[PDB]
Amino acid sequence: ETAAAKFERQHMDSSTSAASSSNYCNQMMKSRNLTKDRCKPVNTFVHESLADVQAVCSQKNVACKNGQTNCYQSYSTMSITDCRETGSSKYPNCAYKTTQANKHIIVACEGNPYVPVHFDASV
Ligand SMILES: Nc1ncnc2c1ncn2[C@@H]1O[C@H](COP(=O)(O)OP(=O)(O)OP(=O)(O)O)[C@@H](O)[C@H]1O
């Protein structure tokens, strides 16, 4: 699995313009293998074309949280959904608070082609 393909699986959801229910996260985290070896604590999904998110690799260059300079912030807010684990969730019954938002995404890019491999933050 390429880092790029991995990024699409953990972070991308073109299927829908946003989460409708408070249990998007439960379905999505399970169905993308994010709750397989353990319950991943937090995970953001992005509801935009794969082309709109890839285009972020030549938008606003900013400093990554780990110190590298291959991070880029989007000029536009984008539709995102934050999944956060509930303290009353125990593997294997992973449970998640769904949160819908419009924020700028920050991603790290790499490769030829230069594509997103890492989600750094949203602002
Ligand atoms: N500037 C960077 N910061 C962090 N990771 C980076 C950076 N640039 C490239 N990467 C690469 O991205 C890959 C994926 O990182 P990671 O597993 O944290 O992705 P993620 O989508 O952030 O996962 P999570 O949702 O668990 O935070 C790593 O193999 C790493 O080499």
Curated annotation (Swiss-Prot):
One of its GO terms (molecular function) is nucleic acid binding. Its EC number is 4.6.1.18. GO terms for biological process: defense response to Gram-positive bacterium. Changing H118A: Loss of activity. It comes from the Eukaryota. It is found in: Secreted. Keywords: Disulfide bond, Endonuclease, Glycation, Glycoprotein, Hydrolase, Lyase, Nuclease, Secreted, Signal. One of its GO terms (cellular component) is extracellular region. Substrate binds at K6, R9, K40, P41, V42, N43, T44, K65, R84. The active site is at H11 (proton acceptor), H118 (proton donor). Pancreas. The keyword Glycosyltransferase does not apply. It is an enzyme of class 4 (lyase). Disulfide bonds join C25-C83, C39-C94, C57-C109, C64-C71. It catalyses: an [RNA] containing cytidine + H2O = an [RNA]-3'-cytidine-3'-phosphate + a 5'-hydroxy-ribonucleotide-3'-[RNA]; an [RNA] containing uridine + H2O = an [RNA]-3'-uridine-3'-phosphate + a 5'-hydroxy-ribonucleotide-3'-[RNA]. Glycans are attached at K6, N33, K36, K40. Belongs to the pancreatic ribonuclease family. Interacts with and forms tight 1:1 complexes with RNH1. Dimerization of two such complexes may occur. Interaction with RNH1 inhibits this protein. Monomer. Endonuclease that catalyzes the cleavage of RNA on the 3' side of pyrimidine nucleotides. Acts on single-stranded and double-stranded RNA. This is Ribonuclease pancreatic. It comes from Bos taurus (Bovine). The chain holds residues 28 to 150 of 150 of the full protein.
